[PDB]
């Protein structure tokens, strides 16, 4: 019957990176606040089961301890609209967070109900509600894997501080990807695999992480670190969602030529913009990704079919 209304079930989330305000009063920017507002509107119109932070949570040197007012001034008070208050955040660290006390950002999980950061790297598991279809997300700490970009003049992480700790995270990720039975597998980290902008591809991730994405049928890798919005897709059908425009916009196309031809499907970096983020919908059929500006405009939309997995 025409009047019978059945919704397509979907898991829905916002992916926002590099939103961490500024280290001087009032500890936030016009861009951070504009994005907090458009994120709230997006949750209230389209819905969201959670928010994923892609690192650089507090600029410029993270936090000192669990009592640092930055938690209040840059996070709690900014993302304060009532449509957001109970929506959980699942968080990982970026380079700027490792310049401070990262353990304090893990511990803050015990104080704020909505802040979830149980360890430097971890696995999340979700069902698409009202179905049997499941999604895994692996949250990586790319600083301990590759090094901190701020230690090098190139701003390219050239070596990890502790090689055995790096190797442990990579071995963990291999064991997990190999054993994952979920219908969709996503991996997230602060640093990019591919990006055409100011930092560009992270060589450590192109060498060590990229091979695993194809081997184990990962749908997408999500990241920030470059302060813009990009969508890329490789020959194996793996998507690269870059969303690091929660606070800054950088128009650099400096590494355009370091990315293989065909990969870039979308880039938005104009420095007039107030930034943006990405909204992801996962249904039984496909994963949809919409990039949304803080003005409210839809910039770009693409789909990733569900694939059978080994």
Take residue 3 and report the two structure tokens written for it: 């009047």
Instruction: State yes or no: residue 18 binds Fe ion (CB under 5 A).
Output: yes
Listed ranges 54-62, 103-111, 168-176, 232-240: which one lies at the site for ligand NAG (CB under 6 A): 103-111
Strand partners, 185: 136
Q: Is 97 in the site for Fe ion (CB under 5 A)?
A: no
Residue environment code for 130-148, b if the CB has 16+ CB neighbours within 10 A, otherwise e: eeebbbbbbbbbbbbbbbb
Which segment (13-21, 61-69, 119-127, 252-260) binds Fe ion by CB under 5 A?
Answer: 13-21
| By CB under 6 A, residue 103 contacts ligand NAG | yes
Among 33, 41, 61, 101, binds ligand NAG (CB under 6 A): 101
Query: Rounded to 5 degrees, what are φ and ψ at 126?
Result: -130, 150
Residue 187: name its binding partner from ligand NAG, Fe ion, none (Cβ under 5 to 8 Å by kind). Answer: none
- Residue 42 binding: pick among Fe ion, ligand NAG, none (C-beta 5-8 Å cut-off by kind): none
Question: Does residue 107 bind ligand NAG (CB under 6 A)?
Answer: yes
Establish whether 151 is an annotated binding residue: no
Min CB(66)–ligand NAG separation in Å: 3
CB of 68 to ligand NAG, least distance (A): 8
299 sits near ligand NAG (criterion: CB under 6 A): no
Say how many CA atoms lie within 13 Å of 232 toward its Cβ. Answer: 26
Q: Under 8 Å CB-to-CB from 226, ≥6 apart: which residues?
A: 192, 195, 197, 198, 199, 200, 242, 244, 250, 252
Kindly state the tokens that stand for 177.
């990807």
Binding mask 46-65 for ligand NAG (x = CB under 6 A): -------------------x
CB of 52 to Fe ion, least distance (A): 15
Q: Per-residue contact track with Fe ion, 36 to 65, x per CB under 5 A?
A: --------------------x---------
Report whether 250 contacts 17 (CB < 8 A): no
Among positive and negative, which fits the CA dihedral 225, 10, 119, 77? positive
Binding to ligand NAG by residue 170, rule CB under 6 A?
A: no
Nearer to Fe ion, 12 or 98 (CB): 98
Q: Which is nearer to ligand NAG, 46 or 107 (CB)?
A: 107
Closest CA to 63 of 117, 16, 13: 117
Binding of ligand NAG by 104 (CB under 6 A): yes
What is the distance between the alpha carbons of residues 105 and 58, in angstroms, rounded to a whole number?
10
Instruction: Give me the least distance between CB of 11 and Fe ion, in Å please.
Output: 26
Q: 69 vs 167, which CB is nearer to ligand NAG?
A: 69
CA–CA distance, 12 with 14 (Å, rounded to integer): 7
Member of 74, 95, 195, 283 binding Fe ion (CB under 5 A): 95
Q: Alpha-carbon distance 37 to 246, whole Å?
A: 11
β-sheet bridge partners, residue 127: 134
User: What backbone phi and psi angles, to 5 degrees, belong to 219?
Assistant: -70, -50
Q: Which residues bind ligand NAG (CB under 6 A)?
A: 65-66, 101, 103-104, 107
Detail the residues annotated as belonging to a binding site for Fe cation.
18, 56, 59, 95, 190, 225, 227
């Amino acid at each position: 019957e025409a009047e019978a209304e059945f919704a397509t079930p979907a898991l829905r989330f916002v992916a926002v990176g590099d939103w961490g305000g500024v280290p001087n009063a009032p500890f936030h920017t016009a861009r951070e606040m504009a994005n907090a507002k458009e994120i709230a509107r997006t949750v209230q119109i389209l819905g969201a089961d959670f928010i994923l932070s892609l690192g650089d949570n507090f600029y410029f040197t993270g936090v000192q301890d669990i009592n640092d007012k930055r938690f209040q001034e840059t996070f709690e008070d900014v993302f304060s609209d009532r449509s957001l208050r109970k929506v959980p955040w699942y968080v990982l660290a970026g380079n700027h967070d490792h310049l401070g006390n990262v353990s304090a950002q893990i511990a803050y999980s015990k104080i704020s109900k909505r802040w979830n950061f149980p360890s430097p790297f971890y696995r999340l598991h979700f069902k698409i509600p009202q179905t049997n279809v499941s999604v895994a997300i692996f949250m990586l700490d790319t600083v301990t894997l590759c090094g901190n970009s701020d230690d090098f003049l190139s701003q390219q992480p050239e070596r990890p501080r502790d090689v055995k700790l790096a190797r442990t995270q990579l071995s963990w990720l291999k064991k997990q990807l190999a054993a994952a039975r979920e219908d969709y597998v996503l991996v997230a980290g602060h640093y990019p695999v591919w990006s055409i902008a100011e930092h560009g591809p992270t060589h450590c991730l192109v060498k060590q992480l990229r091979p695993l994405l194809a081997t184990y049928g990962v749908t997408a890798y999500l990241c920030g670190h470059d302060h813009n919005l990009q969508y890329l897709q490789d020959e194996n059908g793996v998507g690269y969602v870059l969303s690091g425009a929660g606070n800054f916009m950088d128009p650099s196309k400096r590494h355009q030529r370091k990315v293989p031809n065909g990969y870039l499907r979308f880039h938005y970096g104009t420095e007039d913009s107030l930034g943006g983020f990405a909204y992801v919908e996962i249904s039984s059929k496909e994963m949809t990704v919409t990039y949304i500006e803080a003005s409210g405009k839809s910039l770009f939309k693409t789909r990733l079919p569900r694939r059978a997995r080994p």
